[PDB]
Structure 1
Amino acid sequence: SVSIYPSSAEVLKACRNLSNSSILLDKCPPPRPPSSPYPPLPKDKLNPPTPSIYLENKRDAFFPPLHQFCTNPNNPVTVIRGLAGALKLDLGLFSTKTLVEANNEHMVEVRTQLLQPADENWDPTGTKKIWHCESNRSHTTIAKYAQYQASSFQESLREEPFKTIKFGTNIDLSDDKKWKLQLHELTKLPAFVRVVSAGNLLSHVGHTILGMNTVQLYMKVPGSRTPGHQENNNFCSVNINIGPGDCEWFVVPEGYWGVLNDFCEKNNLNFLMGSWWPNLEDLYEANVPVYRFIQRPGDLVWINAGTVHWVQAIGWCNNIAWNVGPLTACQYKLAVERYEWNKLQSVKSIVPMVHLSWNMARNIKVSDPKLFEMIKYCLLRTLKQCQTLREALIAAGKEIIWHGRTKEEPAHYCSICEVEVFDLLFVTNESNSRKTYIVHCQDCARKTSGNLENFVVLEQYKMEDLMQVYDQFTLAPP
């Protein structure tokens, strides 16, 4: 019941300033990748069994402890067995035959890959095992990928230096007028895995983040790989295998992501943006535990926050996937941590955590003190940053044009460095007049116009609005 944060009036008065007391240490320790976790694990604990939920009845899927089992930080992944059958989900709505009938001209992002043996990844000459995973981009239609997927299967039915294969990825199932029956089928899921829910942080973004708060579909042939990654901004993820074939999952706990980052660097690969497939022998030598399991048709895979993982098709199948963000301190903490790390790495945060945090403060009554403090700390830092910049512009006599923002207007990012740009947008005079609105962050704008002569400053939010949202965000009763 104790407020530990200053009021918006106090933050503003603090910004109106050499001799006065501080309100907070604006300096913050910079993000870095963690060392190998303590305590270290012996060899006999490096192949742990996968946390599993065995569903039989529709009632089983709505059992409240399921959500807590999945979000438990000690469980890096949970496989929910029999989920589609328990809910009488019609997986046929996502079959390739149904997709071709529904939208045969829909776009498919093809990844062209080498068919690699089992859990291994070899150089293209088949000489040695390497971490780099060849996966080159092209685009086709559902109709044409479907023909390939079907012909691949017929060819193998004939009983039979790596084969080239094609993985159909990132098929956009967001348009409810093209995918009405498919999307309605997913409303049968329990709330904690649904694409849209009041308890899903990504449902509070206020705009589409494609493939995170909308569904994407994947069409596969054996060997189709999603290489090593953490989810965007460490958000939990949901994956259902449509079948008819199986998928194989490889999972490492979040706490080892620094070790994996180091493995990538040692192999001349970028952890966040590169294409890499771990060598299991390297991980075993370094005492990194690996969860490894098969996802059958109708099985749902829950990837917990920040879990490091990589996946391959064993047979022919489709999968559907999206992300969710539990309303938890752990989820928010890891999303903010990766947001900060992404800035230092100049990697775009697909989830605009500042925009989202302010929407969370508008919409959500937070009753957990630890989560509440994290969100309000973020509001404090960004409110102070905005008012500081605003005063600096006013002090230099730089006009601030009221721009406002429309319904569901997305967060904007810097066209140069790809940082989120919140509230105060820097746009060149030319881009403003032509309404291209190429946003720059402050730092990137100044690098080409130290006094901002070539730029206008557009203001999205009234400062009074932000101050009121901040003051009205208080700890909710349990």
Structure 2
Amino acid sequence: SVSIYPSSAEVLKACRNLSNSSILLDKCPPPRPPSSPYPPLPKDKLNPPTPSIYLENKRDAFFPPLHQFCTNPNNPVTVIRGLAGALKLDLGLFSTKTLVEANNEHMVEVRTQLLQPADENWDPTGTKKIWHCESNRSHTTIAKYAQYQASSFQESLREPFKTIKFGTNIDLSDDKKWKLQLHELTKLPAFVRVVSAGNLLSHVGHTILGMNTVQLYMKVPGSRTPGHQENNNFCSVNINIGPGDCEWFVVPEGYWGVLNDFCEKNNLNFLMGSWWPNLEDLYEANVPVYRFIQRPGDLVWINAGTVHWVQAIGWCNNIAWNVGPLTACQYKLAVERYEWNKLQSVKSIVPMVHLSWNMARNIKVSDPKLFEMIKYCLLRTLKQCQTLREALIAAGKEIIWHGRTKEEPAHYCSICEVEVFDLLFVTNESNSRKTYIVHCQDCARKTSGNLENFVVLEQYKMEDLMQVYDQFTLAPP
């Protein structure tokens, strides 16, 4: 166990001395979208079968190799067949009828869409296949969406596209409204649980809605979730409640640069836009597509960075959340997309700096590659904080001890939405109002070169950070 990182004292001494030798190369290669993977795949390998686990007994679910099979980078997606039945999960707790009985006034975000044929997406005139996926936002209650979902089923029983409505992003975070639902999910094995010691998102220290909390989706046939990677490339878990089936389309992480280019050529934003890929385009470009059906009770594991899009075939509900395996692969993909998001001016829903410092306090990391990635992160941010701190003092500006409360979330810049760690810039008016509306350093200087209109709040004792950094060391196996 040879340590390759400077001590916190050494970092601090190097930040004071403004001649000397360097600690590290501050410059760093900026992120970019990858080129199409090498080696390329021939046409006969562009429709690969889906990695599948066939569960029969509760015991099968707790088999340790299941974990490694799902996180294997070579498996972009895994369908765990018969999960609900092997664990005797009561999916009825998530039926529309049960949900209405429990919280009939609960909010539902509604996406109004066009009912498209099979795997295709046509412009609204039925004239040509396009990538843009019309999906307009409104809001309703569980009671009113339940009513639509049920009558929709009745019209079909009886006997230029039809408009449909998709009930999405239903917040199941409140354990006093959903106690029975959330308790049922504690029956799952650790590696897919919402909360776990082995789940990086359980170390964020606060709620990230829909990632470390459960979301529900209420669907009618044709309800589409457009193409996306998960927030900061975290893995995802999804269970179909039924009674109908869902159809999944999946592209390996390695190809997201190719899909980003398809989005740009089609005048769409990869990260933030609404797009449904044309499968003939993907085929022509040698992009492999995993396509499969998720039945009621089947669990779908979306591996880190997997590009995917989904549509209901029948009437069904789904539940979903994110997990973060404690692996070098997952941490690396999360930090890369954290960096890419900054370049793109897209908010990182997972505050990777805040989270890395929490990981360093709480987790004994025994894998060298993961450990080095985390400590490198601590080093870069520790150095950034002490460098900023020095420049402020040397400029006469004062640093107000602000501290932070139990579970205080990470703060972001109200202008560019970057994470702002440790040193917060707020205007004097937002200071007194205790709206504490945070800016990053760059956005503050844009409105006040000398920071006259700004106070600087400090969240952590530098000595606290220096100690967490020095006590984060490679754990024994």
- Distance, in Å, in 2 between the alignment partners of 1:399 and 1:313 is 57
Percent identity at matched positions? 100
Shift of 1:209: 0.2
Once the two structures are superposed, residues 249-286 of structure 1 have per-residue CA deviations (whole angstroms, 9 ceiling, x without a partner) of 00000000000000000000000000000000000000
- In structure 1, the residue matched to 2:147 is 147
TM-score by length of 2: 1.00
| Structure 1 runs, 4 residues or longer, greater than 6 Å off | none
Shift of 1:52: 0.2
- Distance, in Å, in 2 between the alignment partners of 1:392 and 1:111 is 48
- Distance, in Å, in 2 between the alignment partners of 1:318 and 1:193 is 19
- Distance, in Å, in 2 between the alignment partners of 1:428 and 1:149 is 48
Are 2:269 and 1:270 aligned? yes
- Distance, in Å, in 2 between the alignment partners of 1:439 and 1:257 is 32
Once the two structures are superposed, residues 194-252 of structure 1 have per-residue CA deviations (whole angstroms, 9 ceiling, x without a partner) of 00000000000000000000000000000000000000000000000000000000000
SS in structure 2 opposite 1:237? strand
- Distance, in Å, in 2 between the alignment partners of 1:289 and 1:229 is 16
SS in structure 2 opposite 1:305? coil
Once the two structures are superposed, residues 122-180 of structure 1 have per-residue CA deviations (whole angstroms, 9 ceiling, x without a partner) of 0000000000000010000000000000010000001x301100000010000000000
Q: What is the alpha-carbon root mean square deviation over aligned residues? A: 0.4
Q: Gaps spanning 5+ residues in structure 2: where?
A: none
Q: How does 1:53-202 map to 2 (within 5 A)?
A: 53-158=53-158, 160-202=159-201
- Distance, in Å, in 2 between the alignment partners of 1:35 and 1:18 is 40
- Distance, in Å, in 2 between the alignment partners of 1:56 and 1:274 is 40
Shift of 1:181: 0.1
- Distance, in Å, in 2 between the alignment partners of 1:435 and 1:168 is 36
Higher mean Cα deviation, 17-26 or 391-400?
17-26
Shift of 1:17: 1.5
- Distance, in Å, in 1 between the alignment partners of 2:25 and 2:60 is 49
- Distance, in Å, in 2 between the alignment partners of 1:45 and 1:147 is 44
SS in structure 1 opposite 2:376? helix
- Distance, in Å, in 1 between the alignment partners of 2:214 and 2:277 is 27
- Distance, in Å, in 1 between the alignment partners of 2:162 and 2:412 is 40
- Distance, in Å, in 1 between the alignment partners of 2:136 and 2:423 is 37
- Distance, in Å, in 1 between the alignment partners of 2:18 and 2:422 is 27
- Distance, in Å, in 1 between the alignment partners of 2:434 and 2:106 is 30
Once the two structures are superposed, residues 275-309 of structure 1 have per-residue CA deviations (whole angstroms, 9 ceiling, x without a partner) of 00000000000000000000000000000000000
Once the two structures are superposed, residues 101-131 of structure 1 have per-residue CA deviations (whole angstroms, 9 ceiling, x without a partner) of 0000000000110000010000000000000
- Distance, in Å, in 2 between the alignment partners of 1:105 and 1:225 is 24
- Distance, in Å, in 2 between the alignment partners of 1:437 and 1:172 is 27
- Distance, in Å, in 2 between the alignment partners of 1:398 and 1:111 is 49
- Distance, in Å, in 1 between the alignment partners of 2:303 and 2:111 is 26
Once the two structures are superposed, residues 364-399 of structure 1 have per-residue CA deviations (whole angstroms, 9 ceiling, x without a partner) of 000000000000000000000000000000000101
- Distance, in Å, in 2 between the alignment partners of 1:449 and 1:84 is 58
Shift of 1:351: 0.2
- Distance, in Å, in 2 between the alignment partners of 1:26 and 1:67 is 37
- Distance, in Å, in 2 between the alignment partners of 1:138 and 1:5 is 51
SS in structure 1 opposite 2:414? coil
- Distance, in Å, in 1 between the alignment partners of 2:369 and 2:177 is 42
- Distance, in Å, in 2 between the alignment partners of 1:18 and 1:458 is 24
SS in structure 2 opposite 1:97? helix
Shift of 1:18: 6.5
- Distance, in Å, in 2 between the alignment partners of 1:134 and 1:405 is 42
Q: How does 1:243-258 map to 2 (within 5 A)?
A: 243-258=242-257
- Distance, in Å, in 2 between the alignment partners of 1:36 and 1:211 is 31
Shift of 1:319: 0.2
SS in structure 2 opposite 1:404? coil
Shift of 1:418: 0.3
SS in structure 2 opposite 1:184? helix
Q: How does 1:76-475 map to 2 (within 5 A)?
A: 76-158=76-158, 160-475=159-474
- Distance, in Å, in 2 between the alignment partners of 1:362 and 1:109 is 37
